[PDB]
Amino acid sequence: SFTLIQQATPRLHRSELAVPGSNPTFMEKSAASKADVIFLDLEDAVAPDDKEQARKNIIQALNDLDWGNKTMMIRINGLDTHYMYRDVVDIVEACPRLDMILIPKVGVPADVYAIDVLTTQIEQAKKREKKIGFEVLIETALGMANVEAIATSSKRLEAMSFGVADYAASTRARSTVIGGVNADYSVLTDKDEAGNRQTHWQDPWLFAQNRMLVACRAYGLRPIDGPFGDFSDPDGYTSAARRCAALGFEGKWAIHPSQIDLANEVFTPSEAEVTKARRILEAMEEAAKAGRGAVSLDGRLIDIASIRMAEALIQKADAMGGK
Amino acid sequence: SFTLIQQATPRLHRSELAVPGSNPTFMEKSAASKADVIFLDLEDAVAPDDKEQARKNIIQALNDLDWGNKTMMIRINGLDTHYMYRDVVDIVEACPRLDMILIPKVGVPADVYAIDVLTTQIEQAKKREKKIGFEVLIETALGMANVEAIATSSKRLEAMSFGVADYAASTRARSTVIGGVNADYSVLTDKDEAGNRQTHWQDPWLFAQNRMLVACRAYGLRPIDGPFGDFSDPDGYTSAARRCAALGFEGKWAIHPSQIDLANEVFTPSEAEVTKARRILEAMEEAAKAGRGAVSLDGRLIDIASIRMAEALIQKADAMGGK
Amino acid sequence: SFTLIQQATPRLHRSELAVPGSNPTFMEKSAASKADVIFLDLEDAVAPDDKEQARKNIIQALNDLDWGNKTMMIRINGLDTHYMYRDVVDIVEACPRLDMILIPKVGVPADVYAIDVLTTQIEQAKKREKKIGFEVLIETALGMANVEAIATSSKRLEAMSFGVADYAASTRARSTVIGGVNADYSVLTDKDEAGNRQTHWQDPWLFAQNRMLVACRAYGLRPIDGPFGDFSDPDGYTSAARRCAALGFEGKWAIHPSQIDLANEVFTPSEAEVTKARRILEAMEEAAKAGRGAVSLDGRLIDIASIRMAEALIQKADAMGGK
Amino acid sequence: SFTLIQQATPRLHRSELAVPGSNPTFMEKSAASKADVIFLDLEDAVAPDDKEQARKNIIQALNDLDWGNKTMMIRINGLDTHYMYRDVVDIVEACPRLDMILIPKVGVPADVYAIDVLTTQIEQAKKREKKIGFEVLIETALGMANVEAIATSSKRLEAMSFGVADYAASTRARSTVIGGVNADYSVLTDKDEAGNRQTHWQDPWLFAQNRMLVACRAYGLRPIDGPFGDFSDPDGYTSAARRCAALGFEGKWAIHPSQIDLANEVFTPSEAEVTKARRILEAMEEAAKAGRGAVSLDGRLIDIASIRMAEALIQKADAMGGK
Amino acid sequence: SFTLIQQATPRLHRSELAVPGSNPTFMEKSAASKADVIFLDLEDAVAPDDKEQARKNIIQALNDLDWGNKTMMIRINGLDTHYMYRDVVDIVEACPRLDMILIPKVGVPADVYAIDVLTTQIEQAKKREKKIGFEVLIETALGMANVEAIATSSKRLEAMSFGVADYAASTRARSTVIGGVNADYSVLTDKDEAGNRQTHWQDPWLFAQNRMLVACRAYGLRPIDGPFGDFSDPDGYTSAARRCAALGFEGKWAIHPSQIDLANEVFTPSEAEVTKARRILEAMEEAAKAGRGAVSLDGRLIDIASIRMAEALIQKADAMGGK
Amino acid sequence: SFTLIQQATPRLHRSELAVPGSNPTFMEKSAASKADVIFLDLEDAVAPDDKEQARKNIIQALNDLDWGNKTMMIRINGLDTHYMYRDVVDIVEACPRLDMILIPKVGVPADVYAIDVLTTQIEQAKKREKKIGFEVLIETALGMANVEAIATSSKRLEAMSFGVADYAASTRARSTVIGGVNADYSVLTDKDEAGNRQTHWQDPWLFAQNRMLVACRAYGLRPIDGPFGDFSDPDGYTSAARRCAALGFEGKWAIHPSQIDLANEVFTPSEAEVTKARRILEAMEEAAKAGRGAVSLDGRLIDIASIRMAEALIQKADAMGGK
Ligand SMILES: [Cl-]
Ligand SMILES: [Cl-]
Ligand SMILES: [Cl-]
Ligand SMILES: [Cl-]
Ligand SMILES: [Cl-]
Ligand SMILES: [Cl-]
Ligand SMILES: [Mg+2]
Ligand SMILES: [Mg+2]
Ligand SMILES: [Mg+2]
Ligand SMILES: [Mg+2]
Ligand SMILES: [Mg+2]
Ligand SMILES: [Mg+2]
């Protein structure tokens, strides 16, 4: 294409740990974890009567605890709720350590614009060097119906998470569990020569995951898979993780500490894909040494979109090496 | 999201029985059936030379027969055909009992607008209390390509049906049967350690069903699955029904009387989902008793989109209770 | 619908053979092959340092070799690269035999517009009777995100090919092979009564193929599946071909000569679908004999969209008969 | 531009006479007039209680009177009113003489689509050779805000009329007269060296007329100016007519018989513009004699848009010659 | 049209007085003025170093002074500036008396959305009965280029003001004065028979005013003209006011107390237009007495858009009567 | 607004001289002129049979003559014509001195995209430091109807010229002269107390000029007025120039050498506007010295859009100083 997209800021994002702001002990324990990204939650996991205190707890946690080089985020309240403006104002004013805001229930691009206006103004007032990035949750049918447009809604936007349980609720999917599969979401084969019919299970989230993936990959964002509720089923977690990784997802939520190592292992890039990326970068250097505008590797032209992907993958591999 | 959608009129729609207008005996028998919704057909099931008479038959049937509290609909002829304007004019003028119009082959939002103009004018002339609702058939590749836009095309719009057989024809899918699965729409696994390769069947309608579902659920409509042709295969019907129900579909067509009970059973909401909805409504009442703007259930904020879903589900459960 | 689309020029397109322009011997051998469509490649298969010569080779091959009635195409370089304008100018100026241009990596409708401007001007200068047609490659996440818009981007546009390997690269799908399936892109079933869990493989390209199919079928284009890399696995090729054919795809690439017969066999229309189309055409003639505007077959109205599909299928069947 | 628009059907349209359907005597007298275009009105000039009879009157007038080669139109009731569907159905069914429908108060493109659906179906039923054309009234702020989109809303669309009095009402312009100027819509000059300030009158309809003109001329339609109410002021009529003619308008309404000759005289094309158009057509013939793709006149390339304008102007000049 | 727009909340808005928040004495004096609408300014008239205090001053003024039944507004800082979020949060939290927010420099619809999100959340927190309305300033070329889209950007939106001086700056118009005319923005006539050429002055703001007017009147908003700087020139003020009133503008800014009476006098509706509106309302009552859906006045159908305009004008006339 | 536009490359553009490529003597004489910008024409002024030679002439002129620091442009042939691709390829390949391309008859944004693709590829091949800029001619009703969209069509786009004579032809305006005014484009005043009626001339190009101006000023481009044909009427030229300058236009075409000094004089910025811009830049420096994010001048906040305008004006003033 003649149309070129710039990749978002290239962070390592294999594991995304959710931590309720209402639990300072859990926040403290999380600061020493192996998660790549942590969000401190003001939204779904925090009861209304606890939201004001959780906000205070999070300010203290972001300012006092040692988070290392983790990408630190908050999940703000919904735009449809009165809590949100104080989440953004109080925390962004008080907490230089904050890296990102996770905006829930995003439905249309203007939702993201709204948060960009507010965030920008606070950063202007505080004379901030760091600029906050955004992650959006696609966790409703409305957001899914507008996902491609949402993907281009802010220069801050870096990533989208698939909120599977809230998406199920929004679509009225038959789901009593967070994530997972369903014996009813299956095909019954036509009778074979023996008179037999098999039941082959299908993926209830295939459509959602692929559509969000395409939006992310078209427009330079990280595609992240959401929560998996069955803490007693690491095999099921790992299957779900490997399935979305196979599509191109870059990471997955952890909502129980056991899930952190599982996500980290699955979403580590292969040695081979890192090596290919490194060879692309050396082929770029070669083209510059030769005075040649076109980059070639193993007899193939490597185009600018492909160079940009290679640069992003290397930044991620390099982060792993220094963790 | 800050963007809020109003749910369509909340009807019970588990089973949708198709009845040709060319058969007054079948229409009479259908009036005593257990279908939730009936459409009297002027379109696909009626030969051109029979369309004028079928129109007359339907006027007589809507005016004379006892349909109970069924949602009564007509499937009008295609907008590309000369029959349609007389279908709408003659029946809407003559038949106060009519509840809805099923518009076939919808391709773009302006198709729906056109029917809204005509329907509105006739209702104005007749000084009608009741306002007719619309259901649209997504049964062509054109309609599927525009489904999200179609979903917002009229305040009358309540529901979309996936016309699987006509959709197959439009896409040139290999299909000689109405609905069902296909041994060729399958994956051949890579050889395992024993040298073996399995054939795992896939869902040829997954993309179509999910895209239409997302449009419906984003914009407040009922997602309805279309016909299944093999009357000798209730197990296959039930599998197809349970599979789309698992996604969030609300009902399915019956094109043979045996299919009515099968659809009714599958698309009845679970006791648990009705109970959750009832508890949401009591949590709303609680918030009002306490003077609190935010509704809480089991320690979780229940947002306005979720309240609106609960209200719709209850209206549907209540209808079942009075049938 | 009241909105009507005109079908593209109706070519037989079961097999699409890729031939590198850097290999004149391979080009010569390809001219005697059984492929329906051949593209002479200047892009992915040709190293940068060989592109200028490949352009010359292709001019000689198009002018000198006997291609029969094959649809002859070139795959031009990417719009993001300096080679492209000379590909179009030099070949279109010199080579009346050329039938079509395959535009790679298409991202937005204006990419196609750009090639239409250039192609048109050269045809105006050369006073050409024949008008070149376009095929577009949807082989990036950007193109997939804009596929519906791309489908309406030029009166020359006839077909879209799904570039599976480049699409995988763009989406960061885990893929070291061109096409095929993936043991990780699978679901792990919930434990049954015996404590057992099965692994049911899913289709990593279902979303992509279906979305591109819908765009094509909505807007009158041929949907074509891209390359399959495992030349040692005809069973896998045939499975992949039959799977997309079941959806409605019309043909598939051959990147090794063995794949030509496999594609030709799979994408031949059934005797039954050709017979139905022929009966539609005779029903049209019947309606004209009777003075009737509506066409009827076996008691069903056959609408204009359906007539147009029948006419296209017959043109394709007729081509097979004369090959 | 590479984007090319097809001109509408090229009718002579200098004068457009409005005749109320409630007055059969006036309709009879109008049939012998010198108007180019006549619309028989069911809308603004006909009281509600007279609309049903006016419809009958118009059917009789269109079928019985001798209208010559006039372009014969009806102004249907508003889409927001119950009268309209019977206007279209009854008259189009009964009256082959009808040439066009004037759609009032058009606000959005889908308004035009709606009338195209209904009109098409009736024409299909009646097996009509002639296809009815459309004229739209831009007579509200809504329509003006959407005029460019309305201009591309139907293949039937030929012309737009600026409904000045209804537009004034919609905008709350201070206007007690149909059309004309306003001493208050003026500028007061800054004091000159003598201390004097002049009042220079401005054109209250400049914006409206120019915006509608641009939409028409971009998209191949006739721009027509609406009514002027002061029958005692032919000088004012002629000034208003010459002012919009200077912009490129092609005709103007007559709402009193005296205005017909005034419009005909003003909107006759100059001898010079007809001669230039004729020379363009002979230059086209010259290019064909020489085997040259580019047309040249007096040393200037004459492009396809300019040829199409010349062809339209000649068709209009030829009509005048045969009147 | 079949598309119907709801009118904004119908306030009397002849005069709009600008009062800097940095001047508590001027605010006090303004509370006893005859202005219909007052905005307390935090933006253009307040130096950066005074903005924090002006915010405090305005809170005190809104809470303590007697504003009568005036529509009370604040002009917040620009969205591009850090002051704005504290303007909205502090004042909306503290000041139930506030009626509206005037949003400056609006460029795109999402600017308005952003303020709607923030305003809504604060109102939710405060459990407000009253809902704040919005006025937007169209005072840049960007806003003018997007004015039609801005007009539909919020259910709160009631009015647009043409910020002539800031618009001039944005367009680089030659303007050293706020508003007014320009000897250079004139036409030099062609020589007449005496050899003479006149200079006829044109309206430099005609395009801007008319485009904004059309957006407002299409979408149910009040069109308001902005400031006029020459306090020594009431004749020029009155000319400018009468000129935009003639188009349909509903009011004008006062930036000096002398301008209040001038705006009030010019933008009072005529006795005749109020009488017509009253007769429309009595014709509506008549139609209801007769059981007739169509409203008729003096032999003309009065449509719903026209009824809605009449209702709005009466609400405004009634307000004047009670002032 | 929160939406921010980047200004185009800031060139001095008071005078734009048109020089036919068919006249090498005129090209030589033009190189020593006082024009700011020169376009060497391949389009309107060059007969078809002379276009191939004019292309060669221009290559020689751009490579051999001394153009000083003039902005050097070519007016390429229309996209609808076969000449264009060779204009771009041959000249851009051969002529590093070229600064810009003037694209004629632009109708839609994709026209500009097309030229951006071709231009970019040639620049890539030639390994150019300089990047060519674009100017577009808005000289048709189609382009005027799409002008706002065209304004955002390429990062190369710097300027739009109003092609008055071609625009008149496209709109069918009564115009036998290039530019100028029209006694018929006038208002006839209502009789005064003496029985008199005046004729006040209006501006036939007001709508066009203002709409194009708004598009330019919204999106960071230079608005340039087109040709004036009456070389014997410098007073009329100067009036036309001062009239568009008053709106904010930045320059005007010269099509006769006498017009160069007239344009240069009119479009020189005032001493006062340059001084204000310089004071803005010193206020920016002041804010940086004080550590303050907001810039203040004379008690007013100077926003980023206003800073960017000031920077552009200064770059232009500085250019004048070094000419
Ligand atoms: Cl979730
Ligand atoms: Cl079907
Ligand atoms: Cl590929
Ligand atoms: Cl009117
Ligand atoms: Cl202002
Ligand atoms: Cl011109
Ligand atoms: Mg959630
Ligand atoms: Mg059907
Ligand atoms: Mg490729
Ligand atoms: Mg009217
Ligand atoms: Mg301002
Ligand atoms: Mg021109």
mmCIF file of N, CA and C in Angstrom, chain A residues 1-3 113 116-117 120-121 127 156 290-293, chain F residues 1-3 113 116-117 120-121 127 156 290-293:
data_model
loop_
_atom_site.group_PDB
_atom_site.id
_atom_site.type_symbol
_atom_site.label_atom_id
_atom_site.label_comp_id
_atom_site.label_asym_id
_atom_site.label_seq_id
_atom_site.Cartn_x
_atom_site.Cartn_y
_atom_site.Cartn_z
ATOM 1 N N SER A 1 0.834 -1.209 0.000
ATOM 2 C CA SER A 1 0.000 0.000 0.000
ATOM 3 C C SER A 1 0.863 1.252 0.000
ATOM 4 N N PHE A 2 0.322 2.310 -0.581
ATOM 5 C CA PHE A 2 0.907 3.631 -0.415
ATOM 6 C C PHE A 2 0.573 4.279 0.957
ATOM 7 N N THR A 3 -0.479 3.763 1.628
ATOM 8 C CA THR A 3 -0.851 4.215 2.955
ATOM 9 C C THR A 3 -0.048 3.488 3.997
ATOM 10 N N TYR A 113 -11.217 9.855 22.346
ATOM 11 C CA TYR A 113 -10.954 11.282 22.206
ATOM 12 C C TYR A 113 -11.204 11.995 23.529
ATOM 13 N N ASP A 116 -8.503 11.427 25.896
ATOM 14 C CA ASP A 116 -7.294 12.100 25.391
ATOM 15 C C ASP A 116 -7.336 13.619 25.760
ATOM 16 N N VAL A 117 -8.490 14.286 25.596
ATOM 17 C CA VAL A 117 -8.622 15.677 25.956
ATOM 18 C C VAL A 117 -8.238 15.846 27.447
ATOM 19 N N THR A 120 -4.573 14.931 28.337
ATOM 20 C CA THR A 120 -3.652 15.908 27.803
ATOM 21 C C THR A 120 -3.600 17.176 28.674
ATOM 22 N N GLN A 121 -4.771 17.684 29.037
ATOM 23 C CA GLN A 121 -4.853 18.918 29.839
ATOM 24 C C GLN A 121 -4.140 18.739 31.163
ATOM 25 N N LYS A 127 3.233 19.660 33.530
ATOM 26 C CA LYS A 127 4.512 19.815 32.841
ATOM 27 C C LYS A 127 5.376 18.537 32.822
ATOM 28 N N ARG A 156 -2.236 8.310 21.323
ATOM 29 C CA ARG A 156 -1.859 7.580 22.527
ATOM 30 C C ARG A 156 -2.162 6.132 22.513
ATOM 31 N N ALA A 290 25.641 -0.165 1.033
ATOM 32 C CA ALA A 290 25.772 -0.300 -0.402
ATOM 33 C C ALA A 290 25.231 0.923 -1.149
ATOM 34 N N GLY A 291 24.579 1.845 -0.453
ATOM 35 C CA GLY A 291 23.861 2.966 -1.090
ATOM 36 C C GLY A 291 22.564 2.634 -1.816
ATOM 37 N N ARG A 292 21.806 1.649 -1.336
ATOM 38 C CA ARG A 292 20.691 1.040 -2.067
ATOM 39 C C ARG A 292 19.453 1.372 -1.279
ATOM 40 N N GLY A 293 18.393 1.804 -1.946
ATOM 41 C CA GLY A 293 17.158 2.155 -1.235
ATOM 42 C C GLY A 293 16.362 0.916 -0.809
ATOM 43 N N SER F 1 -9.899 23.937 19.620
ATOM 44 C CA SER F 1 -10.107 22.513 19.325
ATOM 45 C C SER F 1 -8.973 21.673 19.891
ATOM 46 N N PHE F 2 -9.302 20.436 20.225
ATOM 47 C CA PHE F 2 -8.277 19.446 20.515
ATOM 48 C C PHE F 2 -7.607 18.866 19.238
ATOM 49 N N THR F 3 -8.280 19.028 18.078
ATOM 50 C CA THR F 3 -7.735 18.612 16.801
ATOM 51 C C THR F 3 -6.848 19.686 16.237
ATOM 52 N N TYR F 113 -3.982 11.610 -4.463
ATOM 53 C CA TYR F 113 -3.324 10.373 -4.062
ATOM 54 C C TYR F 113 -2.590 9.760 -5.248
ATOM 55 N N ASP F 116 0.508 11.521 -5.972
ATOM 56 C CA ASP F 116 1.444 11.289 -4.859
ATOM 57 C C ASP F 116 2.154 9.908 -5.039
ATOM 58 N N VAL F 117 1.415 8.852 -5.412
ATOM 59 C CA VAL F 117 2.003 7.555 -5.642
ATOM 60 C C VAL F 117 3.118 7.694 -6.709
ATOM 61 N N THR F 120 6.096 9.976 -5.717
ATOM 62 C CA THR F 120 6.904 9.355 -4.693
ATOM 63 C C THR F 120 7.850 8.292 -5.282
ATOM 64 N N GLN F 121 7.303 7.431 -6.131
ATOM 65 C CA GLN F 121 8.097 6.344 -6.731
ATOM 66 C C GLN F 121 9.256 6.908 -7.525
ATOM 67 N N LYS F 127 16.551 9.006 -5.736
ATOM 68 C CA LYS F 127 17.260 9.259 -4.484
ATOM 69 C C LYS F 127 17.457 10.756 -4.164
ATOM 70 N N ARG F 156 1.954 16.226 0.786
ATOM 71 C CA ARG F 156 2.589 17.164 -0.131
ATOM 72 C C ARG F 156 1.814 18.390 -0.423
ATOM 73 N N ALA F 290 10.392 32.175 31.364
ATOM 74 C CA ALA F 290 9.721 32.198 32.646
ATOM 75 C C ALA F 290 9.370 30.792 33.140
ATOM 76 N N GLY F 291 9.550 29.772 32.310
ATOM 77 C CA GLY F 291 9.078 28.407 32.610
ATOM 78 C C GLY F 291 7.576 28.163 32.543
ATOM 79 N N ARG F 292 6.865 28.845 31.647
ATOM 80 C CA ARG F 292 5.402 28.923 31.647
ATOM 81 C C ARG F 292 4.953 28.245 30.382
ATOM 82 N N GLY F 293 3.947 27.388 30.463
ATOM 83 C CA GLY F 293 3.469 26.684 29.268
ATOM 84 C C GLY F 293 2.607 27.582 28.371
#
